[PDB]
Amino acid sequence: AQARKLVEQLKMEANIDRIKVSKAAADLMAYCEAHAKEDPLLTPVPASENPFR
Amino acid sequence: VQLVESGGGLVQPGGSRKLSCSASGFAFSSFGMHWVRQAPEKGLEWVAYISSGSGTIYYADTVKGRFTISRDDPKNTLFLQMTSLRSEDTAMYYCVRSIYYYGSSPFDFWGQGTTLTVSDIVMTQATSSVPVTPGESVSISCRSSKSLLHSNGNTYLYWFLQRPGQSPQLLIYRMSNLASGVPDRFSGSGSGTAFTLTISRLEAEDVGVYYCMQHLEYPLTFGAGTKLEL
Amino acid sequence: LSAEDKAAVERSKMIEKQLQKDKQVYRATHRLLLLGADNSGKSTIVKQMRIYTSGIFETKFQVDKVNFHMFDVGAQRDERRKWIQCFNDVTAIIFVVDSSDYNRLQEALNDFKSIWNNRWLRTISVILFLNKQDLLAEKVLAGKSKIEDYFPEFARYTTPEDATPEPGEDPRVTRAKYFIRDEFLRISTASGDGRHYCYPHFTCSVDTENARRIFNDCRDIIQRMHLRQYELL
Amino acid sequence: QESGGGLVQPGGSLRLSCAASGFTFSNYKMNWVRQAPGKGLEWVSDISQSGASISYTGSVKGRFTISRDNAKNTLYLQMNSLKPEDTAVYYCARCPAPFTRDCFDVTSTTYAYRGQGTQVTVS
Amino acid sequence: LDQLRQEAEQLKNQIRDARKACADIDPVGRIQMRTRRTLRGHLAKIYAMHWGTDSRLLVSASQDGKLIIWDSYTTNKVHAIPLRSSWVMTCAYAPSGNYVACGGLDNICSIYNLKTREGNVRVSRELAGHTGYLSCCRFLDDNQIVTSSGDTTCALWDIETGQQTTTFTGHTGDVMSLSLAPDTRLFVSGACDASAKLWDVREGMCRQTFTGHESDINAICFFPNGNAFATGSDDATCRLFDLRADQELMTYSHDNIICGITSVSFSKSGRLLLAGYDDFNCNVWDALKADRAGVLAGHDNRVSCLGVTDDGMAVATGSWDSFLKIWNGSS
Amino acid sequence: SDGLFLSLGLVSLVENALVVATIAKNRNLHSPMYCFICCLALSDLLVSGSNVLETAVILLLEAGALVARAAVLQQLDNVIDVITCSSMLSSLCFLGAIAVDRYISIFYALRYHSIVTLPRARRAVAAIWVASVVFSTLFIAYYDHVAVLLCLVVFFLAMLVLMAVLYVHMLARACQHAQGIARLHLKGAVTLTILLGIFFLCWGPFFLHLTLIVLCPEHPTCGCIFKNFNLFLALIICNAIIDPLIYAFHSQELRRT
């Protein structure tokens, strides 16, 4: 029973279309470089606008 | 939530009368308890203040040296002590719960009120009567004596309505927010010293007198009161 | 500091005085973890001394004005290595073992090794309630199973000098029980760096004085950790 | 991937192999655990990362010699005098956490890190 | 039966071959965070923190058995939430801010209502459909939640009814971590099997499984894009998976690290990958270089929790030293 | 004496201030033990400051820009005496308090957190400094009496004895633990020997001086060793150098920072 269910699960999971890893990582790099300026922990905020001090 | 109280009435003139507040239905020990009275034909004026933990107590400068506030957490009750009231002490009093943390809504629930009759930022409301038709956009303004935008973005002006038969209610706290059981028509804004309350679409239950409270620096002060006639 | 912010730094302090109330309760009550197996008898241990799909089963008991927890890990799964980390900074680990079924005795030894050598359970002492000694007594009195089948090293093994048999005890059962105890102390002396010791015990289902045993043991762990803190030991 | 079983008479000799890949053999405290038919899952032998510490279960104390080749990534268990009551499928248990001397759950009913097994039968 | 395992092995070989065929910048610098706050008051081990959606409020779950709501600017106890199960292993802050969810060794997930009309933070619903300890709970919306448990199951619950709209049962070990996607349509988990899985929240089926690790998995969080995530493990490495590529991208380990990761949180822009470790200190990995961007070495015991605001202003870490430091830059 | 005395004072003050700052910074150690340790550290700081200021003002009086002012002369000397007596009687009772903390933790291991806490710790600290200042301002500025330098005579022995009994009655337990360990299978001698012999060697000279000053003012040696009162006080001043080092600076928390 478990063998048949496992076989069916791998069969279903093997039909998923897959994009090249180059594009998959390029998307993450583009997202990081398109939202960095609004990430304070990466480029620090000025102290006046910094509300923890 | 239910703030019911009494105590005023008939007493020998020049004497003392203790006002209570039988709070019921909420976590009393975590709330701040104010007091407010109302001139029989005019607007409100602050009375007293006891904070959470019974550590901070501020008073009304007019009667600071002689009013006596108190509270009793383990029975969810409140008390206020009047001594030798003058002839100016003919007014009807209110009980207020409030709580202060990031995002909280102070003065959210105003009690029902009780009468007591024995025979500084300043708010100006030159407007006292305005005619308006239902379904039309209307506005009511209140003016202050100085600025209220504190360094942390707040505005510390509480809009209000006193419906023609019952106690006040919160329409907006800190000049931009909204209470719990309040429709989305209401809205307000502040200019820096002058304010305004906007109702997008009037209906039957938006008649009465609108009030304004500041809270930036003590004592607390109200406006004159702008009655609306439909 | 505004009027509403002044009350924001005030309720925070009334919550401070509530967390400084629970610190006294938290550090004046010692926690214990109970571990064992299917036939070990930890269920019987709890049922005997607690009375004097829930993930964790609690237990309340105090002896001589000291409050003890005992977290019996119940309706969880077979694996152990992710909910055992949660029981660091605990006073002790009670590890009931049934030594009257030699088939599972070595598995219990493996479990004791796992608890003893655990990276987070290296500052944690163990109270071994070697359980149901009487079953192990008839396992050799009416001798039918040869212990040397799973324990060849028991053949050339003699009763330790410091043995204290209960009155009216056959020497052979003493050999067997002290033998198993010695197998449970070998892992203890093998490693631990003295920061945590193993505490052997000769317990059964009807052993009606376990609470004092946890009491004394825990007093010993805390005394020894302070004595090392004072470099007196 | 346990492999290397088959038929053997009482007192015969055998060798059990465990081909390992993908999980850096040379770091984990490998094991050998045995499930005889009709009986539960009980451990037999053990070995550290350097082949220094070795443990037996007494029932296998005189015969079964464990070895380990971290270079070829294979775990062995030498058979010398297989008695008739030592028939089973031989699993290849691996320790949970690297750089550790503790192995908790290598005898679990459903354990992630364990070979398919090798059925070894003795007449 | 044998043919079934043969076909399963053939399909696994096909999956591996497909993945193999599928596979084919200024450094961040030494980031330092001078602990602009230090949030003391926890009495015991801290295990979980979660940010509010307003980048200001913050709840922390500590194994004393109490959730504590703090104001990240002025360091105030906004709320004090005592519990019944002291062995808390997860906490969540609902996006609306009205509810917070906590779960731990006890198989329950209790829902706590913040913005109540009577004043005191109180329960909303107890979720009791598991047979293993709950290790990560996340609010989908105000009336939906997702929980990953010890028994090999993730779940989606209807908070109002109290029943699992869908059960997720493809794992083989203790599920440790759980991360809802930005669009709240997907979630990923690690389950002490070296097998991280992606799931669909409506249909009710596991879409993908990733098998890069060589030991258990401790923490997981989506990239703020929603098309990737990272996993933390006891094998002293962190790994980065991509959903569409269905593979491994980077591994986060260096020869001097011997101990395993227990809490991973990304940056709001995703460039900084903070990670909690066993060795009494955190680390920040530039998630595209796999280098040590910096160390949040300020704790006296094992870090256990980690999280970054929705505005990227600050990051909070809590080790079992009972302290929840809050970190930010300077200048 | 004159320069080495000041040098010892200042090096002692440095370590005392370092201990106080480290404890105040690493607030995870906010326990009665570490409160008592830091309070001993700052009482030793007081010993250092008062002793050094004695000689500092004595040397600065050569450039006496301020008038001689015999009243001021008898006031300032009495005041600097008051400080170097207050510091003595605080350091003494603080070593005693550390010993009693040790002992209560050992013999009440399951009840230490239900006996001693930060309220009682700070209360005992305040009471000890109150007793110190009161007894110093009474024993001097109100000079030799029948009770003074006689009740103080009882007071040093009665503490070192109560210092000794506690750290001897915990090497006995430490030994008893070794037999228990080895039966199922030393340094405490060093610990007791240091924590007693260092204290005795550092403090005994001055107190035998003050025991002789009240009963033996006539011998050629019972007055010759009196002339080494400066050496006696220099032996005392090594306490602010040694005691915080041996009590603190032994835990891993202090050794980290």
Neighbour count for residue E30 (Cβ, 10 Å): 10
C-E C-beta contacts closer than 8 Å = 91
At A17, which CATH number?
Answer: 4.10.260.10
Chain centroid offset of residue C33 CA: 7
**Any E CB within 8 A of A5 CB:** no
Burial class (CB in 10 A: 0-12, 13-18, 19+), E203: exposed
The closest of D41, D12, D9 to D107, measured between CA atoms, is D41
Return d(Cα E269, Cα E258) in angstroms, integer.
29
DSSP annotation of B159 reads E
List Cα–Cα distances, C81 to C32, D108, E216, E234, F188, in angstroms: 18, 11, 10, 11, 38
The full DSSP string for C83-123 is TSGGG-S-SEEEE-EE-S-HHHHHHHHHHHHHHHT-SSTTS
Q: CA nearest E43 in F: which residue?
A: F28
DSSP annotation of B124 reads B
Considering the segment(s) E1-327 as one domain, its CATH architecture is 7 Propeller (2.130)
The closest of B117, B106, B112 to B156, measured between CA atoms, is B106
At F48, which CATH number?
Answer: 1.20.1070.10
Q: Which residues of F touch E300 (CB under 8 A)?
A: 28, 253
Chains adjacent to F (≥3 CB pairs closer than 8 angstroms): C, E
Q: Is the distance from CB of B49 to CB of B60 less than 8 angstroms?
A: no
The full DSSP string for chain D is -EE---EE-TTEEEEEEEE--SS-GGGS--EEEEE-TTS--EEEEEE-SSS--EE--STTTTT-EEEEETTTTEEEEEEEEE-TT--EEEE-B--SSTT-S---STT-SS-SSB----EEEE-
Return d(Cα F12, Cα F238) in angstroms, integer.
8
Query: Taking the alpha carbons of A37, A41, A43, A48 in that order, is the dihedral positive or negative?
Result: positive
Q: CA nearest C11 in B: which residue?
A: B52
Reduced to 3 states (helix: H, G, I; strand: E, B; else coil), residue B47 is strand
B near F: at least 3 beta-carbon pairs less than 8 Å apart: no
Neighbour count for residue D10 (Cβ, 10 Å): 12
Burial class (CB in 10 A: 0-12, 13-18, 19+), C129: buried
Chain centroid offset of residue F94 CA: 6
Bond preceding residue D96 cis, omega within 30 of 0: no
Q: Is the distance from CB of B132 to CB of B203 less than 8 angstroms?
A: no
Q: Which residues of C touch E74 (CB under 8 A)?
A: 5, 8-9
Structure tokens at D14: 């055998």
Neighbour count for residue B153 (Cβ, 10 Å): 7
Closest residue to D24, CB basis, from E214, E216, E234? E214
Across the interface, whether the CB atoms of E106 and C56 are under 8 A apart is answered yes
The closest of C48, C31, C157 to C90, measured between CA atoms, is C31
Q: Which residues of E touch A12 (CB under 8 A)?
A: 205
Query: Residues 6 or more apart from D111 whose CB is under 8 A from it?
Result: C79, D93, D105
Return d(Cα B115, Cα B17) in angstroms, integer.
12
Q: Is the distance from CB of A33 to CB of E263 less than 8 angstroms?
A: no
Return d(Cα B132, Cα B228) in angstroms, integer.
7
Closest residue to B1, CB basis, from E54, E79, E117? E117
Chain centroid offset of residue F106 CA: 23
Question: What burial letters (b/e) apply to B73-110, b meaning 16+ CB within 10 Å?
Answer: eeebbbbbebeebeeebebbbbbbbbbbbbebbbbbbb
Cα-flanking dihedrals φ and ψ of residue C59, to 5°?
Answer: -150, 130
Burial class (CB in 10 A: 0-12, 13-18, 19+), A42: buried
DSSP annotation of E269 reads S
Q: Which residues of B touch E119 (CB under 8 A)?
A: 26-27, 30-31, 99
Reduced to 3 states (helix: H, G, I; strand: E, B; else coil), residue F39 is helix
Tallying the residues shown for chain F, one arrives at 257
Domain of residue A32 covers 1-52
Return d(Cα E138, Cα E122) in angstroms, integer.
18
Across the interface, whether the CB atoms of D108 and C78 are under 8 A apart is answered yes
The closest of E246, E217, E331, E231 to E287, measured between CA atoms, is E231
Q: CA nearest D46 in C: which residue?
A: C110
The full DSSP string for E26-83 is ----------SEEEE---S-EEEEEE-TTSSEEEEEETTTEEEEEETTT--EEEEEE-
Q: Which H or E element spans position E197?
A: strand E196-200
Return d(Cα E19, Cα D122) in angstroms, integer.
43
Cα end-to-end span (Å), chain B? 31
Return d(Cα D44, Cα E313) in angstroms, integer.
55
Domain of residue F67 covers 4-256
**Any C CB within 8 A of E213 CB:** no
Virtual torsion, Cα C42, C46, C187, F106, nearest 10 deg? 180
Q: Is the distance from CB of C53 to CB of E107 less than 8 angstroms?
A: yes
Neighbour count for residue B138 (Cβ, 10 Å): 17
Tallying the residues shown for chain C, one arrives at 233
Burial class (CB in 10 A: 0-12, 13-18, 19+), D22: exposed
Q: How many CA atoms lie less than 13 Å away from C138 in the CB half-sphere?
A: 3
DSSP annotation of F229 reads H
Reduced to 3 states (helix: H, G, I; strand: E, B; else coil), residue F7 is helix
Q: Is the distance from CB of D84 to CB of D122 less than 8 angstroms?
A: yes
Query: Taking the alpha carbons of E253, E255, E260, E264 in that order, is the dihedral positive or negative?
Result: negative
Q: Is the distance from CB of E46 to CB of E304 less than 8 angstroms?
A: yes
Q: Is the distance from CB of E44 to CB of E62 less than 8 angstroms?
A: yes
Return d(Cα B96, Cα F122) in angstroms, integer.
41
Query: Residues 6 or more apart from B136 whose CB is under 8 A from it?
Result: B202
List Cα–Cα distances, F138 to B12, E238, F47, F148, in angstroms: 62, 69, 18, 9
Place of tokens 């709320």: E79
- Best of F27, F28, F253 to mutate (most E CBs within 10 Å, chain E): F28
List Cα–Cα distances, E295 to B200, E270, E303, E305, F253, in angstroms: 54, 17, 12, 15, 20
Return d(Cα C193, Cα C198) in angstroms, integer.
12
Closest residue to C2, CB basis, from B51, B99, B152? B152
Enumerate residues preceding breaks in chain E (C to N > 2.5 Å): 24
Q: Is the distance from CB of E70 to CB of E318 less than 8 angstroms?
A: no
DSSP annotation of A40 reads T
The closest of E63, E109, E106, E108 to E86, measured between CA atoms, is E63
E-F C-beta contacts closer than 8 Å = 6
The closest of E2, F150, B217 to C3, measured between CA atoms, is B217
Tell me how many domains chain F contains.
Answer: 1
Q: How many CA atoms lie less than 13 Å away from D114 in the CB half-sphere?
A: 22
Q: Which residues of C touch E135 (CB under 8 A)?
A: 82
Query: Residues 6 or more apart from F202 whose CB is under 8 A from it?
Result: F235, F236, F238, F239, F242
Cα-flanking dihedrals φ and ψ of residue B72, to 5°?
Answer: -145, 95
Q: Which residues of B touch C13 (CB under 8 A)?
A: 53
Burial class (CB in 10 A: 0-12, 13-18, 19+), F145: exposed
Neighbour count for residue E245 (Cβ, 10 Å): 24
Structure tokens at B196: 């305004």
Return d(Cα C113, Cα C109) in angstroms, integer.
6
Place of tokens 């015999």: F70
Tell me how many domains chain A contains.
Answer: 1
Tallying the residues shown for chain D, one arrives at 123
Query: Taking the alpha carbons of D90, D95, D99, D100 in that order, is the dihedral positive or negative?
Result: negative
Chain centroid offset of residue E161 CA: 26
Place of tokens 């004005």: C65
Using alpha carbons only, how large is chain A's radius of gyration in Å? 22
Name the β-bridge partners of E251.
Answer: E239
Tallying the residues shown for chain B, one arrives at 230
The closest of C40, C204, C208 to C109, measured between CA atoms, is C40
Secondary structure of D1-17 in the HEC alphabet? CEECCCEECCCEEEEEE
The closest of D122, D119, D14, D22 to D76, measured between CA atoms, is D14
Query: Taking the alpha carbons of F125, F130, F133, F135 in that order, is the dihedral positive or negative?
Result: negative
CA distance C116 to chain D (A): 8
Question: Phi-psi region for residue E163, left (φ > 0), alpha (ψ -120 to 50) or beta?
Answer: beta
Cα end-to-end span (Å), chain D? 25
Return d(Cα C81, Cα A37) in angstroms, integer.
42
Reduced to 3 states (helix: H, G, I; strand: E, B; else coil), residue B138 is strand
Structure tokens at F82: 């008051």
Reduced to 3 states (helix: H, G, I; strand: E, B; else coil), residue B197 is strand
Reduced to 3 states (helix: H, G, I; strand: E, B; else coil), residue B78 is strand
Structure tokens at B180: 């719990």
Return d(Cα C64, Cα E162) in angstroms, integer.
44
Q: Are strands B129-131 and B226-229 parallel, antiparallel or unpaired?
A: parallel
Chain centroid offset of residue F104 CA: 20
Q: Which amino acid is at E66?
A: K
Cα-flanking dihedrals φ and ψ of residue C74, to 5°?
Answer: -100, -100
Using alpha carbons only, how large is chain B's radius of gyration in Å? 17
Return d(Cα B182, Cα B197) in angstroms, integer.
14
Return d(Cα F241, Cα F180) in angstroms, integer.
37
Q: Which amino acid is at B171?
A: L
The closest of E146, E136, E144 to E160, measured between CA atoms, is E144
Chain centroid offset of residue E48 CA: 9
List Cα–Cα distances, C202 to C101, C131, C178, C184, D1, in angstroms: 16, 7, 9, 12, 42
Question: Phi-psi region for residue D19, left (φ > 0), alpha (ψ -120 to 50) or beta?
Answer: beta
Return d(Cα E264, Cα E158) in angstroms, integer.
27
Query: Residues 6 or more apart from D85 whose CB is under 8 A from it?
Result: D36, D122
Query: Residues 6 or more apart from E250 whose CB is under 8 A from it?
Result: E239, E240, E287, E288, E290
Return d(Cα F193, Cα B201) in angstroms, integer.
89
Q: Is the distance from CB of F198 to CB of F242 less than 8 angstroms?
A: yes
Provide the total of helices (H) and of strands (E) in chain E, helices listed first: 1, 28
Q: Helix, strand, coil: what percent of chain B each, to 5?
A: 5, 40, 55
The closest of F113, F35, F112, F176 to C224, measured between CA atoms, is F176
Q: Are strands D54-55 and D31-35 parallel, antiparallel or unpaired?
A: unpaired
B near E: at least 3 beta-carbon pairs less than 8 Å apart: yes
Find the angle CA(D121)-CA(E2)-CA(E7) to the nearest 5 degrees: 145
Structure tokens at E93: 């802050």
